[PDB]
Amino acid sequence: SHRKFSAPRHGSLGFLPRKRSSRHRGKVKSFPKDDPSKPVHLTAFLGYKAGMTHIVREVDRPGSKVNKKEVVEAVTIVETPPMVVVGIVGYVETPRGLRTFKTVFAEHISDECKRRFYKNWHKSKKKAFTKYCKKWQDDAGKRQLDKDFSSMKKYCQVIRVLAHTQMRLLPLRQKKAHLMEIQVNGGTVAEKLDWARERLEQQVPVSQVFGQDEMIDVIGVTKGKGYKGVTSRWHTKKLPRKTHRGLRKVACIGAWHPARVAFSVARAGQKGYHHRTEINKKIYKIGQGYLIKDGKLIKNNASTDYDLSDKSINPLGGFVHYGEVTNDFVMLKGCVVGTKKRVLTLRKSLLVQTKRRALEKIDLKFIDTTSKFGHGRFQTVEEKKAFMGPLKKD
Amino acid sequence: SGAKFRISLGLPVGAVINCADNTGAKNLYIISVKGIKGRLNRLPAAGVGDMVMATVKKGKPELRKKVHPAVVIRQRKSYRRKDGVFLYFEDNAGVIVNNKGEMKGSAITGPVAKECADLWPRIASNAGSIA
Amino acid sequence: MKVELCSFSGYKIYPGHGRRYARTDGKVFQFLNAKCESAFLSKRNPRQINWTVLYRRKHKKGQ
RNA sequence: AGGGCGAAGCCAGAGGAAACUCUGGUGGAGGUCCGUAGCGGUCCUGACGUGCAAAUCGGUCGUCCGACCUGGGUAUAGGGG
RNA sequence: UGGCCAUGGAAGUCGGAAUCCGCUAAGGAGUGUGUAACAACUCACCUGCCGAAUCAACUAGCCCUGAAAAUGGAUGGCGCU
RNA sequence: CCUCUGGCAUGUUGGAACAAUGUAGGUAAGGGAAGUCGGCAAGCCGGAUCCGUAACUUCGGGAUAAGGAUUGGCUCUAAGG
RNA sequence: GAAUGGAUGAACGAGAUUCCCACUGUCCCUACCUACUAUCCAGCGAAACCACAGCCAAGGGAACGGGCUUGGCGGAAUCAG
RNA sequence: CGUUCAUAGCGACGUCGCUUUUUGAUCCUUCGAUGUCGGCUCUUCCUAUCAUUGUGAAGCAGAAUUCACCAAGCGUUGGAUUGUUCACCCACUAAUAGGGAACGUGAGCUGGGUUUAGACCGUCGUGAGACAGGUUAGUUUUACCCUACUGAUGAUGUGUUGUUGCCAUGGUAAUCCUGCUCAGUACGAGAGGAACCGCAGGUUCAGACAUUUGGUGUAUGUGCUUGGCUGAGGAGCCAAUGGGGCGAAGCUACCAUCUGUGGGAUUAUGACUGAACGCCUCUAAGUCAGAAUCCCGCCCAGGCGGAACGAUACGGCAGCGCCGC
RNA sequence: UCUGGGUCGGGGUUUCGUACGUAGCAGAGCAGCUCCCUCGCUGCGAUCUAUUGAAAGUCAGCCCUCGACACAAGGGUUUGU
Ligand SMILES: [Mg+2]
Ligand SMILES: [Mg+2]
Ligand SMILES: [Mg+2]
Ligand SMILES: [Mg+2]
Ligand SMILES: [Mg+2]
Ligand SMILES: [Mg+2]
Ligand SMILES: [Mg+2]
Ligand SMILES: [Mg+2]
Ligand SMILES: [Mg+2]
Ligand SMILES: [Mg+2]
Ligand SMILES: [Mg+2]
Ligand SMILES: [Mg+2]
Ligand SMILES: [Mg+2]
Ligand SMILES: [Mg+2]
Ligand SMILES: [Mg+2]
Ligand SMILES: [Mg+2]
Ligand SMILES: [Mg+2]
Ligand SMILES: [Mg+2]
Ligand SMILES: [Mg+2]
Ligand SMILES: [Mg+2]
Ligand SMILES: [Mg+2]
Ligand SMILES: [Mg+2]
Ligand SMILES: [Mg+2]
Ligand SMILES: [Mg+2]
Ligand SMILES: [Mg+2]
Ligand SMILES: [Mg+2]
Ligand SMILES: [Mg+2]
Ligand SMILES: [Mg+2]
Ligand SMILES: [Mg+2]
Ligand SMILES: [Mg+2]
Ligand SMILES: [Mg+2]
Ligand SMILES: [Mg+2]
Ligand SMILES: [Mg+2]
Ligand SMILES: [Mg+2]
Ligand SMILES: [Mg+2]
């Protein structure tokens, strides 16, 4: 018989094999369509989820009840120290797909990057790209290099730069810097390639990719939760108290007579550590890192035009389970995928953004900087020292 | 013009919020919440500012033994305002009302939540304190 | 962003944090955290409780 | 075990013209109540269900001075007890 | 020619018995529209133009409509004009 | 419930982890039986002292009816041989 | 329907119902924690069951096939569920 | 019948069908047993479409509407009584459409009901006993095998190894509503009373997350407190987590917060040019618009499928890469 | 050898709510002795004040140290165009 009282089914099939993702670094499954017209640029970046916090802002959507009313708002800090371009890699269209065609690597490559290429660095002699870099200083090699670049000019269509992180500049344990292919979207391929050939071995900061009040897509791996039962992993009803063989289950897997259990039926398995591409996360603040002209410039982070203090986005006692954000960072609206410390791919949108909400200009009023390691009540240490007065530790 | 925003709604069907207008009713047995499509097994729930059908369980015998519309005015379940302040109220409370939003009483004992005030003007007019 | 003061302890309450209570008498209290609010609801006279501002004013601490 | 209720009888005081009646005690009745050991075995339709167990376990329960519980001895044997 | 029956109004026109003559080139005592009822409109006979076939009613062949079921599916399959 | 006398080595094993399902315990915002055949299960209540105690009644009961208040520590007082 | 007993009825009931107050994760709606498991390891080590075996759709067929026909298809050895 | 008018909507007397969500026939299968109702829970299909998209119809002025077409994408709820299926009532709603899957689903539960044994009542029986007549009490076993599904190591290949990648094939997702505006406007004698574009939000669903609010809390963190025990103080411990305040981190909740997208082919339909048929016709050759559909996109997984690039065993015995013969 | 990661220490953060000791003319009262002084002195005495936002914990999965201490090319199995 039919099921009596209808109800929409639990969980989406558009997300499954609900298995542990192969990758850790979230792949960009599609870069935006390079119109050939606008100038060249990078489409993606690779940051790190340092931590959350508040903002306060005046909102300007006329019509709303909240028009010209200061709301608060959660935000993620994605610490994003500049990447280093160490390669380009040409692709060519085929009817089979999109074959990689030619990879030209830079001359010098950091041990940050070289780390990646060995499973055990302690034990290696660190001999990678050793016979490669010989090419970059002779007649023969330099000529072959030029012919490779020329061939890419003749044949290739898509060009991706290879860059990698500056694992050096982070509070993370790891030294093995994440590489990633990032796509150069812009003018003609010959122009496109000579841009990336100029950028080779060079820094690239965040502000060169992204701008403020820009919708971007966060790509990463979800905070993993191990083996989980069907009630956790699918949010199935619990069965009642009296159930004899347990109650965090599904009762009827399936009907008798497709005499197999279907792929659509809810089973217990891996919950979390899935790959996920959340879209439309507006950049409220691209924040300038600590720098030196005479003394430190720690202010330039979490100070606003209306606050004017001497904060950084770092709260008291740091971001928890992370560190100090001593580098440039972006500040997205809302939560994003994954854990603290997780490497996170940003990506420019796939989508022509023209909604009132997606063109809204964000002027921040106040960044909360109170500790997250307990219930914080002081924004800065100087404020605390004022409020408390002197302590026995003096 | 400007619409409501959702708020943590802690009056499922089965609550007896106290009538906070001068009718003569004391309680308001919420038998249903107006404008709820709802899902299997799920109780219809009315926060503050929500319309509601309401039997009176104790009070005058004019009102007893029939259904009236009503509005929830305070509620003990702490909702979050858009300015990031949570707010709760010490008591759940409402007012007997007609279809078109007018009170059938005349004066509201206690404060009304401004989520209810902005959305219900005739309630707001008879409300002494707001928020 | 009008920073308010905790009706128990005395500390300031920055926009994000804490909770707002609206008693039926028709007066409101702000609580920094639950710790304050619990002492308030259990009727603890904050001048008796050391860590509050009201106590330390009463006992002339600092200065 | 330990508690509760407090029946007859008894004392004093007060009233009553008498009949006798009230008030305060004392007294300690009962297949009386709570409740241990004991005896039992309600519900969880709990645990267990190739068990610890060919009927057990846990909590929860009924009863707990009486048609009470219980050892040993002794009587009744198969269309019979 | 408000023809007759029918008045509730049918002078062609809810219905029904009738149902012919004149002028005629020719128009039914009327196919309908519509009217309380008319009116007004609409539906032969003949021309003017154009330039050889035209049109009706049956009938039977293929094809199509008629033709709605639950795991995904079976001219055996692939396919086939 | 904790202790001495006396007695044991955790009831036929150890180690490392701390997933899902369980078995046995707990806690939960707002609502309060909307759950379910059914308040099943758990929760409320609980001791004592002081008040206060209904209908009904076989006048014995009902009755711990219900419903209330108090309770610690410390320093004293008075009363009982 | 009147000792095949009728009508009653205080007290009593692990007896059968219904409502109210209280109380609660029964539920809205699920969540977190603890212990013993389950898990991995050393040692030890059973049983039921067993024609052969073990991916499907449809067909026909003793009228619901793992095996047959026609199609889809098929990749060692395993772990927790 | 529908004032008039067979056919907007209907439809007698007759007639032709489909359907197996009714009940009968029947007895082919199973009696060395295929667990016998309902509810819960979960998935999937069908359409005979209640709503939602796109449209033709009216006895469609508007509003409300019934009739029909494409169409099953997405929905179709909360309760009172009843073991119920069914039924009815209240309430909300956009709508509270209908079914199938061994009348889906008991090694998934439950066991209220049927349907053993204990008992009561009525009627029947001389009686033992009977009763699709009522009542109450009554044991719901096993998975460690194979498959299927879920996740988890691996597998053959590529000389070995690592890299960054492509993408065959699978899956797939968004939903509907309110308010404001249009506007008391069109339309209508009035009564009443729309719509497109905007704007603001919300339902249900999905995917995350913990800044904040809440929950948990054996950090056994820090107080407080009962009974006991170290002669006491101090410091502690025991009472299967002694109890209780508050509680970091961490999990976690529409109980907190964030995000949810674009094309193509066309269907129904309405059209163009235009014969057939000197006219006329959406059609016959030819052309246009066209959708909750379908296919892709995004999104998830990634093939006994490929890719470019790196490094390729100094040695103490080594072993190999090219080249030519 | 971007000299490193680790243990201990130190900051920061944070949880709780002000440790022990000592002092006090604080302290309801009581006592002993006397100078029977009742602010006599000395003792008992919950609690109170001060020292003291004190004490204590704070990665084990919080943040910074570059202070102290050691320890850091080591082992085993592999694989060939
Ligand atoms: Mg259905
Ligand atoms: Mg059971
Ligand atoms: Mg925190
Ligand atoms: Mg339900
Ligand atoms: Mg049992
Ligand atoms: Mg078992
Ligand atoms: Mg044993
Ligand atoms: Mg033990
Ligand atoms: Mg042992
Ligand atoms: Mg033993
Ligand atoms: Mg609760
Ligand atoms: Mg129900
Ligand atoms: Mg119910
Ligand atoms: Mg019970
Ligand atoms: Mg009683
Ligand atoms: Mg009789
Ligand atoms: Mg007689
Ligand atoms: Mg009889
Ligand atoms: Mg078989
Ligand atoms: Mg007629
Ligand atoms: Mg049959
Ligand atoms: Mg079977
Ligand atoms: Mg159809
Ligand atoms: Mg069945
Ligand atoms: Mg089954
Ligand atoms: Mg069973
Ligand atoms: Mg039964
Ligand atoms: Mg029986
Ligand atoms: Mg096992
Ligand atoms: Mg002590
Ligand atoms: Mg014990
Ligand atoms: Mg057409
Ligand atoms: Mg077209
Ligand atoms: Mg189109
Ligand atoms: Mg695809």
Swiss-Prot record, chain A:
Constitutively monomethylated at His-244 by METTL18. Methylation at His-244 regulates translation elongation by slowing ribosome traversal on tyrosine codons: slower elongation provides enough time for proper folding of synthesized proteins and prevents cellular aggregation of tyrosine-rich proteins. It is not required for incorporation of RPL3 into ribosomes. One of its GO terms (molecular function) is RNA binding. The modification N6-acetyllysine is found at K135, K285, K293, K365, K372. There is a cross-link at K293 (Glycyl lysine isopeptide (Lys-Gly) (interchain with G-Cter in SUMO1)). InterPro entries: L3_arc_euk (IPR045077), Ribosomal_L3_dom_3_arc_sf (IPR044892), Ribosomal_uL3 (IPR000597), Ribosomal_uL3_CS (IPR019926), Transl_B-barrel_sf (IPR009000). Residues 17-30 have a biased composition (Basic residues). The modification Tele-methylhistidine is found at H244. It is found in: Nucleus, Nucleolus; Cytoplasm. One of its GO terms (cellular component) is cytosolic large ribosomal subunit. GO terms for biological process: translation. Component of the large ribosomal subunit. The ribosome is a large ribonucleoprotein complex responsible for the synthesis of proteins in the cell. This is Large ribosomal subunit protein uL3. The gene is RPL3.
Curated annotation (Swiss-Prot), chain B:
It comes from the Eukaryota. Keywords: Cytoplasm, Phosphoprotein, Ribonucleoprotein, Ribosomal protein. Component of the large ribosomal subunit. The keyword Ribosomal protein applies. GO terms for molecular function: large ribosomal subunit rRNA binding; structural constituent of ribosome. The modification Phosphoserine is found at S8. One of its GO terms (cellular component) is cytosolic large ribosomal subunit. One of its GO terms (biological process) is translation. Belongs to the universal ribosomal protein uL14 family. Pfam families: Ribosomal_L14. HAMAP family: Ribosomal_uL14 (MF_01367). The modification Phosphotyrosine is found at Y29. Component of the large ribosomal subunit. The ribosome is a large ribonucleoprotein complex responsible for the synthesis of proteins in the cell. It is found in: Cytoplasm. It comes from Oryctolagus cuniculus. Coiled coil: none annotated. PROSITE patterns: RIBOSOMAL_L14. This is Large ribosomal subunit protein uL14. PANTHER family: 50S/60S RIBOSOMAL PROTEIN L14/L23, LARGE RIBOSOMAL SUBUNIT PROTEIN UL14. Its main location: cytoplasm.
From Swiss-Prot, chain C:
The chain holds residues 1 to 63 of 157 of the full protein. The modification N6-acetyllysine is found at K27. This is Large ribosomal subunit protein eL24. One of its GO terms (biological process) is cytoplasmic translation. The keyword Membrane does not apply. It comes from Oryctolagus cuniculus (Rabbit). GO terms for molecular function: mRNA binding; structural constituent of ribosome. Mono-ADP-ribosylation at Glu-4 by PARP16 inhibits polysome assembly and mRNA loading, thereby inhibiting protein translation. Its main location: cytoplasm. It is found in: Cytoplasm. The gene is RPL24.
